[PDB]
Amino acid sequence: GSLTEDGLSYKEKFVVRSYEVGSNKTATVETIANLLQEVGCNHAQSVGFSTDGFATTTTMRKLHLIWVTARMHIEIYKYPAWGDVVEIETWCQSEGRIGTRRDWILKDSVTGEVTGRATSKWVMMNQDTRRLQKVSDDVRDEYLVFCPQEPRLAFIPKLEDPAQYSMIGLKPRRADLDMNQHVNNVTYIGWVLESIPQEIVDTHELQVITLDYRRECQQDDVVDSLTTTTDSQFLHLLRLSGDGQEINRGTTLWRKKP
Amino acid sequence: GSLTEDGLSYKEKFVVRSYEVGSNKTATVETIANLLQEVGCNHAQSVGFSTDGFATTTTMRKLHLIWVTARMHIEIYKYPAWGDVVEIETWCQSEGRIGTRRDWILKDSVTGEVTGRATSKWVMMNQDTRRLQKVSDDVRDEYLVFCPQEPRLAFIPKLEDPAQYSMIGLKPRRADLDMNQHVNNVTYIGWVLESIPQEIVDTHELQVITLDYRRECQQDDVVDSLTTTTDSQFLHLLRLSGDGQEINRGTTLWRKK
Ligand SMILES: CC1=C(c2ccccc2)C(=O)N(C(C)(C)c2cc(Cl)cc(Cl)c2)CO1
């Protein structure tokens, strides 16, 4: 991949792999989320951020601050097949003192058609206290020149008991942990979807997913995935085993297979 | 990637991805096993096999047979870092009537130094009955021309109760199922390693894994991973939760970091 002409966005091509696809021989939404993160990480490395975190700025490192996902919104018009080339363009925008927003456009590299779009909201957290805080001038100074400064946009209630559907006792595997031994953001997507009935997954494609991130799942945590029906639309809640804390809430929109 | 000069092997380069690495910022053994499968799948497609199975020949389709892994043996000398370029060469050889053998060599793309090797034995079976079939002349005729004909080589007891270590209630998620709707062969590797104590994983690197595949885990099955100590060496057993039907047995060899 590489920075675009103006150095304010980053493009990368990916060949969809045999193990990245599900029943339809098309990329899973988990694969798409992984590719989105990869092109985001590669953008960060191309403008000189260190590999030790997600675009931790010098001052963020001294103050023990990290970027964490508040929200992820993905819309897929067409999932690319095994062996297809997808091109993903990504950029990051400052959102004043609240945090940063990373956006993505997915294209079929052969046709140039837009096959999907994504947007994510990231906030700053003290890595030690897990408390959120406003982006200071000092931190913004260290990344604003890498961001388009005119707007460039690619583009949830709490599930009530009883849930219509559930998948309980979901556990992180060592493969779900990133370099920092934190649960990968993409695992949460997989967990949300686990409580959708197989009959829906077998006959529908996921068109839209919106996830709110409340709290991390640790390596030794156990998670329950809860789903209620609200094209089919669902409301989602991930919470810790034992009526523990909410970790995620979300919605999905599914379209009938063709 | 592409077929090599003589058309009897396939090479592909991979740039190791951010999410493919663990603690040391080097590729997981699960990532390496996935890349091995991918370069194997891409070889199959380059010599004309369709995506509907793992290199199902015309006659295998008529007889309702598929290739399944009987045994996987991987040795890693050096796990490549995030952003490193690894080159994998792969080829397939007939094993008389027993089945096929796919081998892999992993190299540092820049130095040509061999960083790993793998070999796998694959057998023909009806997925539903699990009944094994010796490779007939008619099936061999449909793939032998894509294989080197002279040998080219890249290069287990049942755990007794009680196991020293265990991880119980392991269940496949939707991402663990392949395009043909069965549990990915790499999931079994992850499950085996789940019962290795954290203290070993934190201080050691996996140098060797040998897995014997006894029968498939279905989408709704629940698995127990059992490990006993035998450089540290372990014996491994994956069995169905409840009835204790054997799914896999294996051994691992770990070196200090
Ligand atoms: C400085 C910065 C950038 C950033 C901004 C402009 C250019 C490159 C990175 C950035 O993308 N950040 C976030 C947190 C959005 C990010 C997202 C992703 Cl999926 C990967 C990385 Cl590794 C990081 C925040 O901090």
Ligand SMILES: CC1=C(c2ccccc2)C(=O)N(C(C)(C)c2cc(Cl)cc(Cl)c2)CO1
């Ligand atoms: C015909 C064939 C080939 C084969 C033989 C020569 C050239 C290409 C494929 C082959 O590789 N087979 C196995 C089953 C070993 C294989 C392994 C892998 Cl990791 C992927 C595929 Cl998709 C299949 C079996 O049958």
